[PDB]
């Protein structure tokens with residue numbers, strides 16, 4: 001998978017299930033173009049967002065809809081979303097896992113980047 | 117001080133000094149309007165961004181220019197910047213501290229929301 | 233796997249490979265008895281520490297040897313290790329993934345707990 | 349103040365108040381000898397643990413009684429406590445702040461090590 005997202009709930013010690021994720025790519029005119037979206041599975045993972053061909057060089061924004069997740073669980077959280085912005089593939093194709101750990105007033109995010 | 121930002125460096129175990137921070141407020145047309153900005157001090161803190169009168173309820177984005185910070189230290193970073201997007205709510209406590217802990221491929225952020 | 237450990241390097245954006253991990257279980261006399269040990273693979277994962285039969289109720293300490301990891305990479309870090317202490321299996325068997333994210337002066341740790 | 353501890357709650361976005369903190373120093377026989385202790389204040393901070401004269405180089409353990417904190421708030425926690433084990437080094441800066449961010453199934457810790 002060239003781009004995978006994994007999300008964990010720090011209150012429950014579980015995968016964060018059914019979290020909406022939107023990926024954007026910065027366009028030539030500096031706007032954020034919709035690139036891919038999906039929602040995390042029962043494992044907290046989102047696979048299948050893109051393909052090697054379509055995941056070209058660029059600046060990407062992964063927007064994890066944390067508010068919609070907490071509100072569905074009946075919780076009022078602090079953040080609107082968690083947003084990971086990075087340049088991808090600029091020295092050739094890489095595989096990226098974007099991981100996030102969610103609490104109502106906090107989040108942590110990291111990237112695992114590998115060369116196939 | 118209704119809004120403060122504090123930034124640490126997890127690689128050096130030190131405040132993150134001279135990091136640019138931009139705060140935006142979401143406008144009615146969903147665009148991000150500049151609201152306040154500054155650079156973190158020797159203590160990693162940015163005070164004086166706004167006033168009680170100016171800081172009304174709404175959605176704010178705090179963008180921390182982490183890429184330039186790491187580059188100035190000679191370290192290769194993953195993110196373009198760190199973003200913190202949140203709603204200010206008058207129903208809650210009245211002082212917001214946005215804290216961030218920076219590593220080259222990760223970051224953590226939390227909100228400390230208190231009343232004097 | 234009843235107990236798995238995963239470790240990630242926040243400076244490199246990679247698995248943390250060849251990290252030594254020692255698990256202890258608190259004995260009747262309140263000392264920490266050696267329970268299992270191993271080291272993370274190329275994927276940053278440590279499987280095979282224990283079995284369902286041998287992983288009984290108790291208070292466990294997972295000690296991740298972060299200093300030895302950083303020093304092997306030629307880095308002087310702050311912590312001696314990262315230490316995760318928790319009661320396991322006290323309402324019947326569970327599966328535990330202990331995750332850690334390492335920086336030279338920081339670390340983060342979370343648990344994914346599932347019921348088989 | 350050569351050693352300070354600050355603790356936040358990631359669920360409430362607030363200092364972690366009245367959390368017990370115990371500091372130990374490693375003795376020659378590898379046992380942990382009590383060194384200092386206290387409870388975090390209304391600001392989540394614990395000052396006055398030691399003095400420059402008492403705080404010599406060595407290995408220290410800071411144990412934060414997170415389980416009791418969460419229980420007092422009616423929240424089910426994973427960890428027995430959070431531990432931070434580190435070496436004090438005179439070669440480095442002279443003031444240590446040990447910071448921790450608490451969630452029920454996770455915690456993060458960092459060191460802010462500075463000179464006056």
Ligand SMILES: CC(C)(c1cc(Br)c(O)c(Br)c1)c1cc(Br)c(O)c(Br)c1
Pocket residue numbers: 006007008097099100101108110112238239240329331332333340341342344
């Ligand atoms: C170690 C890593 C990167 C991870 C990567 C993959 Br892929 C996984 O499947 C799992 Br479970 C963990 C991780 C992620 C988050 Br979220 C954390 O809060 C912490 Br601490 C560590």
Ligand SMILES: CC(C)(c1cc(Br)c(O)c(Br)c1)c1cc(Br)c(O)c(Br)c1
Pocket residue numbers: 122123124213215216217224225226228354355356445447448449456458460
């Ligand atoms: C920036 C830093 C190190 C911090 C240091 C001091 Br001293 C403070 O008073 C505050 Br308020 C924040 C911090 C600490 C934690 Br615990 C975090 O989860 C994150 Br994110 C950042």
Ligand code: NA
Pocket residue numbers: 090091092
């Ligand atoms: Na290139």
Ligand code: NA
Pocket residue numbers: 322323324
């Ligand atoms: Na029981």
